[PDB]
Amino acid sequence: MQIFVKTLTGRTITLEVEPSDTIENVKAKIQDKEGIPPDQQRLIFAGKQLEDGRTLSDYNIQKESTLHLVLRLRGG
Amino acid sequence: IKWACEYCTYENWPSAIKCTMCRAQRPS
Ligand SMILES: [Zn+2]
């Protein structure tokens, strides 16, 4: 399946993901296209932050769903 | 009665004047 990740600027990127993929894998998929380290990025779905441990199937992410991407660089 | 931010979906606590996630401001 494919899902859509929506940045804060309003830009939308599409990702070829399988339900068995972990959130960790998703942030790596984002890293492939955007070039940002998976630890400086965080994903939001259903008003909650997604943890790298669980998979999409655990979070009920389905085909053509929308995730929100927020970036925060380490301030020390 | 958690409020959701305008710029990201994240629902925050009523006491928070700013979202914890994208550091946006409280909506009018
Ligand atoms: Zn926000």
What's the token pair of residue A61?
Answer: 């992410």
For chain B, how far is it from start to end, CA to CA, in angstroms?
16
Cα–Cα distance for residue pair B10/B16, rounded to 1 Å:
12
Domain-wise residue ranges, chain B:
1-28
Q: What is the resolution of this structure in A?
A: 3.4
Alpha helices in A1-76 (DSSP H): 23-34
Q: Which of A44, A48, A61, A71 to mutate to test the interface with B (most CBs of B within 10 A)?
A: A44
The answer to whether B8 is a known ligand-binding residue is yes
Query: Does the beta carbon of A48 lie under 8 angstroms from any beta carbon of chain B?
Result: yes
Is B21 in contact with A46 (Cβ distance < 8 A)? no
Long-range contacts of B16-22 (CB under 8 A, 24+ apart): B21/A42, B21/A44, B21/A49, B21/A70, B22/A8, B22/A70
Contact A5, A69 (CB under 8 A): yes
Beta strand pairing call for A41-45 and B11-12: unpaired
Q: Does A73 touch chain B (CB under 8 A)?
A: no
